[PDB]
C-alpha cells in the first residue's frame, strides 16, 4: 500500500461551523491576526488574547459543532492504511480526533490544551483560562498560555513532518489557503521527493497549480469522493 501524507487546513472544518482568518481582509473572527495570534499581541494585551481563545475554545465544544463527512473519510483512510498513513493538520480544533483519527500531528497546536509559559509542559484544558490560572508543573507557578502556535513561532512536529514528506508516495492537501507557511510549501517538498500531489479544496489555493491532481467543491462531498476513489484503486 502506498504511503499517504495528508495535510489539512481550515477549509475542512468550515462546514462544521469553525471559521478562520481570511486573506481577503486578514481577519480572524473580525480580529487582526497581529492582535490575537502573535507573541507581541499576547504581550501587549494578554487579557484580550486569553479572552479570544476562551471564546474559540467554548465555541468548539458547542453541540452544533460536529465533524463532517470529510473528517470521517480521513478516519476511514487511516483505518485502511494503518502505519502507512499520517495526518498533519494546521487546525487547532479536535474534529479529526472526534472523527476517529489517531496520532494526528497538530503543527499549530490545539485549542483544548494549554502550556506552561515557563516549562513548556502541556495540559489538557477544556475551560476558560483566567489570570488566576497557573501551572502545577513548576515550583514557582507560572502563567498558562494557549497551546497554539502563533505567527512568528516555530510549528510543532516539524522533524516528523519533513520525514513524512520525503517518504510519502501520495501527498494530499485539504482545505489549505496557500497563504500560511511553512505548511504552504509542503507540496514543493513532497514533489521534490517524487510524491504524487493532490489538492482537495473549496476553492483553489495560491499554490494550487503545483499539484498534479486537484478537485474542488464542498469538502463534505469532495473529500469522501476522493477517498473512495483512492481506496478503490487499492483494490
Amino acid at each position: 500500500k502506498p504511503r499517504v501524507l495528508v495535510l489539512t487546513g481550515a477549509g475542512i472544518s468550515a462546514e462544521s461551523g469553525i471559521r478562520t482568518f481570511r486573506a481577503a481582509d486578514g481577519l480572524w473572527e473580525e480580529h487582526r491576526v497581529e492582535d490575537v495570534a502573535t507573541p507581541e499581541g499576547f504581550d501587549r494585551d494578554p487579557e484580550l488574547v486569553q479572552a479570544f481563545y476562551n471564546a474559540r475554545r467554548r465555541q468548539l465544544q458547542q453541540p452544533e459543532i460536529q465533524p463532517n463527512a470529510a473528517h470521517l473519510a480521513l478516519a476511514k483512510l487511516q483505518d485502511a492504511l494503518g502505519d502507512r498513513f499520517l495526518l498533519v493538520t494546521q487546525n487547532i480544533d479536535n474534529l479529526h480526533e472526534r472523527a476517529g483519527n489517531t496520532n494526528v500531528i497538530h503543527m499549530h497546536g490545539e485549542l483544548l490544551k494549554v502550556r506552561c509559559s515557563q516549562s513548556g509542559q502541556v495540559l489538557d484544558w477544556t475551560g476558560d483560562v483566567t489570570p488566576e490560572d497557573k501551572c502545577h508543573c513548576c515550583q514557582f507557578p507560572a502563567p498558562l498560555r494557549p497551546h497554539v502556535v502563533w505567527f512568528g513561532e516555530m510549528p510543532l512536529g516539524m522533524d516528523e513532518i519533513y520525514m513524512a514528506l520525503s517518504m510519502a508516495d501520495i501527498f494530499i492537501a485539504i482545505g489549505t489557503s496557500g497563504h500560511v507557511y511553512p505548511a504552504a510549501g509542503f507540496v514543493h517538498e513532497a514533489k521534490l521527493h517524487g510524491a504524487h500531489t493532490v489538492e482537495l479544496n473549496l476553492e483553489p489555493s495560491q499554490v494550487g497549480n503545483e499539484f498534479a491532481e486537484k478537485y474542488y467543491g464542498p469538502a463534505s462531498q469532495v473529500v469522501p469522493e476522493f477517498v473512495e476513489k483512492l481506496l478503490k484503486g487499492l483494490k
Binding site: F151, G152, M154, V180, P182
Partner: peptide, 7 residues
C-alpha cells in the same frame, strides 16, 4: 522550514 508566517 522557518516559523509560522503569512504570505
Amino acid at each position: 522550514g522557518g516559523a509560522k508566517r503569512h504570505r
